[PDB]
Amino acid sequence: MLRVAVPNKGALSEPATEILAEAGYRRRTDSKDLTVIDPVNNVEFFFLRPKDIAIYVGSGELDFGITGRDLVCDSGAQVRERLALGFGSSSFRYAAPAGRNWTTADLAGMRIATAYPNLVRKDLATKGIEATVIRLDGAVEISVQLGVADAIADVVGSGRTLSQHDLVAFGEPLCDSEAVLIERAGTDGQDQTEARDQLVARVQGVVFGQQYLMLDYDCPRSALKKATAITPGLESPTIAPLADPDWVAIRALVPRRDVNGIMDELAAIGAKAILASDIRFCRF
Amino acid sequence: MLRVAVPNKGALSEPATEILAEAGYRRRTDSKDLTVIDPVNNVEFFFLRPKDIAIYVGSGELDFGITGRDLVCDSGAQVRERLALGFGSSSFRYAAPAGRNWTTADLAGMRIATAYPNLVRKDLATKGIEATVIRLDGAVEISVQLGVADAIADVVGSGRTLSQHDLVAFGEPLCDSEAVLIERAGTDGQDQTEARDQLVARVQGVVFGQQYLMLDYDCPRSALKKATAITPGLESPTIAPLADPDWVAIRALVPRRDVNGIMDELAAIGAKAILASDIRFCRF
Amino acid sequence: MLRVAVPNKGALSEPATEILAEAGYRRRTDSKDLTVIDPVNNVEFFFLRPKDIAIYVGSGELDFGITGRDLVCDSGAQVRERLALGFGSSSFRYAAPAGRNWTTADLAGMRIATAYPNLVRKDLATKGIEATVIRLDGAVEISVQLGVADAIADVVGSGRTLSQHDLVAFGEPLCDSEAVLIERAGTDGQDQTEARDQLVARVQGVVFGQQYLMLDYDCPRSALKKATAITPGLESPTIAPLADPDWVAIRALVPRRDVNGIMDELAAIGAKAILASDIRFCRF
Amino acid sequence: MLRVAVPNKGALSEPATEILAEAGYRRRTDSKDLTVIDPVNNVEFFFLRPKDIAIYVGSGELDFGITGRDLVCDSGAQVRERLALGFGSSSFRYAAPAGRNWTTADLAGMRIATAYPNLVRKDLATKGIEATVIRLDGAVEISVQLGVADAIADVVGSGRTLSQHDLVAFGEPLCDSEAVLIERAGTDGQDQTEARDQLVARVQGVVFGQQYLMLDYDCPRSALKKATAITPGLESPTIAPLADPDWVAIRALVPRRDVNGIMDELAAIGAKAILASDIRFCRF
Amino acid sequence: MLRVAVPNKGALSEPATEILAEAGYRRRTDSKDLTVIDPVNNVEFFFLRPKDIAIYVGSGELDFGITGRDLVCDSGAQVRERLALGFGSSSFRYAAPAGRNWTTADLAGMRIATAYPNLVRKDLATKGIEATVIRLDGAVEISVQLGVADAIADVVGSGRTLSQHDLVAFGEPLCDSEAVLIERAGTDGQDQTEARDQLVARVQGVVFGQQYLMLDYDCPRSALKKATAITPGLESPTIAPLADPDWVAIRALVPRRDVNGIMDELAAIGAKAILASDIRFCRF
Amino acid sequence: MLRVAVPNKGALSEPATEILAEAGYRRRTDSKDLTVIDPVNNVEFFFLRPKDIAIYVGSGELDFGITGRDLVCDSGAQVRERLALGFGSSSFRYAAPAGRNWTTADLAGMRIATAYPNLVRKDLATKGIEATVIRLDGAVEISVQLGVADAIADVVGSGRTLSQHDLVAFGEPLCDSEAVLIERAGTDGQDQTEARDQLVARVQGVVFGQQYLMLDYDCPRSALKKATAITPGLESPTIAPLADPDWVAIRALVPRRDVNGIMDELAAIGAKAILASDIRFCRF
Ligand SMILES: N[C@@H](Cc1cccs1)C(=O)O
Ligand SMILES: N[C@@H](Cc1cccs1)C(=O)O
Ligand SMILES: N[C@@H](Cc1cccs1)C(=O)O
Ligand SMILES: N[C@@H](Cc1cccs1)C(=O)O
Ligand SMILES: N[C@@H](Cc1cccs1)C(=O)O
Ligand SMILES: N[C@@H](Cc1cccs1)C(=O)O
User: Fold this and answer.
1) Cβ(B216) to ligand 2 under 6 A?
2) Its GO biological process terms (chains A, B, C, D, E, F)?
3) Which of B240, B244, B272 is closest, CB to CB, to A240?
């Protein structure tokens, strides 16, 4: 029996449930209750505060959790990062009032406000800089105008929040906010390592599969050799006859980021009825 | 022209609309209005109180409805149950205050509170027990603490509601709450039996299809005979060549409940890029 | 870099975002913010008032927009209508109090209230009729009871709003409300015509694809010739062997509106496990 | 320690809590939890389904409840109606399809649908009429169009629901829906009758007080005798000097329904700065 | 029977209903339905689109309405403004991109976007300036960035919307947005002028009363002459004895804007227990 | 110009705004924006995270804030507590799994989870106990079941959260959660101490006033001496004649907690029409 922590609120909550459903796990009946038991797969899901999930995996009885990479950095927990999940990512920056030409060495001896004080203290220490790091609960950008800090450190999305408070980012970026699957650092026994590997393999099937689309298209046999070079697939394109003996249908996986270039090439050699559909799971 | 009753509220409402959409019927424009007309399919949908749907089908002009099995038991209506739909299911139990070792024969001469008094009276009568059944509108669990009843009878989900009021279930379970497609018990004419059968066949396509996934995978020709035995499909696996002449692609339906065992077997004999995707409709 | 206007509210807003996602464009992170930048595809999306989108495309810097056809008629903007999108459609009618036998020539010299005064004035002028057209902001049906107009002109959905105010429609219908992709009437340069055509082709892939389903079914080789005539596909049916040498699997696109007739024919000649699945994109 | 049932939902819920607050009882912290304990006043409040409150008072351990008069009629409970509360009132009528000249004797042998079957059966029996009364859970007006009943019986607010389904009311009105304070029919002991009377007196202070306004106005001593006859107050007007020796200020309770006529009379005899303010509690 | 138009949505809707309730009119049962009938006071209330209310009063059958002053300016309706209501007020300004030193004469021949085109055209014409005024449905501030206009004209609240789009206001302010009670310009008959005056007098009682507070305080008789000069009241302070013969209690209306200065003066001469309470109605 | 921090969310937010409105300060226009400027009173209000308000007052530029007493204890800020506000109060307890007879000395060397780690560490240190205090973001009660802690420390409301997780409180209570007005520990200048004192006096007027009701009643002159002893008021009862020379009206403040006992005594000596009304402000 495995126990998995899922964010119960915020930007990571819906895509975390979506990726667990695509891996075949029982979805949450309604947002009211806070555990979901999966008797088929032998897993229990707990819906917890996002900033706490790393502590529950690192110090508690949870085998796995989904949370942001910056929250793992800030927590001090000793856990394994098994997979980057492909959502929630955003840079983490220092920032200070615009029009002042701020640089990293200006931070020495200043007051820096953040919701991630352990992350920031470790970053400054590696760069050999000492400063006063002030813990806040959230929404730190207003703290400069209000006189609590000289500068801030926060997740920056597209700069809306920095711009709306006349702040500009500077310095090297810190630990980012991409969603990750984390695992407790342990060994336990043999009959537990197997059950753990099964979950990682299933989540990995979604993480990998979601990078591709299936192309299906009708192709003249005369353009077949060209078509095969344009869509070589993960192993090799599938080729099946049509009723019309001068034609075939071809099936091949293609990366989502390549799809529009690929289709233009196929049209130019005679391909017709080019279909593209989402992949939600693929065990390579 | 057919008339179909759909629950307008509660746990059955969204999955009932979802199953009707997957059968190809026009979905509700917005939750405000309470009828949807489908000119293409020649069907009108009425969104009604769930506890009333069995009476509208049994005594009214509706040909079909979707409702819970326990609500059909409680209604006294004479209707046909054509399909179990695969959602909404939960046990229906007697319960009484914890720590008292309650048994079914303890009910004789007691006061029993329930929102389903006809269901409970028929159940007691079959077991040869007489008691005072008190009709309540809902949320019956608090009625013991408040002195209206000695015991209750209700849908139990996972026991959250029983536990939160210090109640424990006992006795044989009663008529459960699984969602069902019900039909009016009739004959009408010939030109009406045909239109009725068409709807049942389409809903059945969803009920059956939703139990499977399509597996698509690349396989070495040397492991082909093993692969065929692992995924025999509904009739027989589809086999198509790849461009690489030492390989094929195989397509076969597999039950959702078997999928993870199946994939492990395929990987161990050489299969690569194992894809799995939802089936939403299949006419066997 | 292209700029595209999307309705931010109302009946057109969700299906407009859905069609842009199926064409492969980055979906809106949350309904709070009002621009979404797509660095991959090199497009910026602006979420604007629906009644204003035609003016932003016609007079502003936007290359494209999605809006209702009646709003383009009312705006006076000079834009190209490139695609009808297949949603949001509804008739646009004159209406007047029930039980009075109203005809178009009764409008001469009357007061007509509408939220689309330019559309109505142009319609009357073409028919050679003069009247006083009163601009209102919305919900015009109550304006007769309240004495501001003798008749109205409005989008009629199914007549709920007309019926609920005792109004009946008359006369030839006006410019309807179907959703359309509009483009700025221009030429600009060469490197801009190409980027524009790419977007139209991708949206067209969704508009075309969404009219079909993929049928997949197992078929005896003895019924193969009949099967090919029943599902001829967009080019020609795909045919692949099963493991069982007396059988094949057939794949063919079929129009959604034909699907249930088609499947009945296939069952009657021996076809088994008839699958149907949505198409979300097809470049013909 | 007293126990009081308050509707947890619907049209009676907010004004019931408002009247209990004005009587000085602790208000509900938030709509989530379902009991509120008042240690000061020694009362516990339970927030229950409105249709069940009469059964909890009549058969359970609750001393008091607030509910509709029609729900008491339908419940069959033996409880005392102590106060009419002055809100929630509406007529209860039979109704049948418009344009048919329906009368009470037309009900004999017909099918009548209602959410209050015990109320309706008792009403028919008193009039010497037999019919088939069909219990429905709610929203009964659509049941005629759908073929379950020939006529209905329901609370009619202003006829919106009857009109929107082409129904017209007929016959003598039944038990109405005015909110009432009900009490368990009992005697218990001496130390319980006292605590019960205290609550009734406090609620009665609100019910009585809310029928009046306090008038405060400056008046010339020459118009004093006229003023006293216009506002005689509950006992006699209060009269106090102003600094200016030719003037006084007068205070008197006046019924809300009389206030505007009263003020016009006072202005016409010289009164100035006529103030009116709500009364929320008055023990006569 | 009078008919009154109330905004059904937006910033004016709640304070408009609040002022009508304090004048003693029946409040809206729930936001669903769109008329409220007051049989006691013989008035019917219609809840309409705010931008349309001036047209319903000016051209329709409504006797009164509550709307913004700028909406009356933009409508072209001929109505009487009877009372300024004391809420909703905000300036109406031209604005253009920051850092450009814009002045009113820069508008000549430019494109100006606004939701109030008739208001703006009349303002420009009075100043002897010609320009192209572009009607938009709302949210006009983004129209400069998007290339539809050179400048805008809009209600400015505190400049949040101008600042968030890098716009700065210039020129003389236009017709503002303060809420007003408007009346149809007419004469009708005698028995209608009376009913109209009654409503204006009652609303005026709230508009006037809401500018004051009632002060009630205990005062030594030795400081009485000073106290009378500090709070002279609307006519003259009320003076009543306390039980203690060296003391009195004084009651006087004071303007809300003066209250804190007044109380400081009273404390310094010996006044104790200084009470202040809201006035909701006063007929002077 | 003063700056005041108000909680923007949670249980303290609405009563904090209510108490500031009753002191005469401008209320927040809508929950969207996060500052409100009061030009009349010369105060700016900032709506901030509750757990941060003590840091903004202690280290920032804010003169005042409203927050919980436990949050001041946990923050380490050096601020003055000027007033207890009379809402939000609740005990703060240690707790551990039920049925184990837990005592304070059992905490030594254990793991204790809390959202208020500084408060808990200082409490343990004063009692001479060492333990491992684990910071969590919220909802700490589940942390025992999940293996992160042996015991917890949290605000307990009525024990719902402890009971729902099978925890029981033990030991002496810690710093509680009552709402307080806090002030920055400073001196600044002379012209700033005055403006600060004015705000404290106005909030104190609400805190004091809200503990009383005004009684107004008609009394026979023969029962006057008894009446004066029953309601002596804050200074002495107000006495005014009625028109009827055998009667007077009496006005006196009485504590809310005494009111029902007082009224019973007044009725028994002949008092009639006993009115009671809320006090929202009183400067003693
Ligand atoms: N044969 C193609 C498509 C696939 C069929 C089955 C799995 S992948 C490929 O390898 O990409
Ligand atoms: N031939 C495979 C897969 C299918 C293709 C078409 C329908 S089912 C089977 O029977 O399971
Ligand atoms: N060959 C079939 C099905 C398709 C396969 C690939 C594209 S369309 C057809 O043309 O309809
Ligand atoms: N004396 C007046 C007003 C009141 C003063 C106190 C109670 S009622 C009356 O009897 O109406
Ligand atoms: N006599 C005082 C207070 C009032 C008593 C009644 C009306 S106004 C004044 O004129 O202000
Ligand atoms: N004179 C009474 C009532 C009051 C009148 C004015 C202030 S307090 C008292 O001191 O309680």
Assistant:
1) no
2) L-histidine biosynthetic process
3) B240
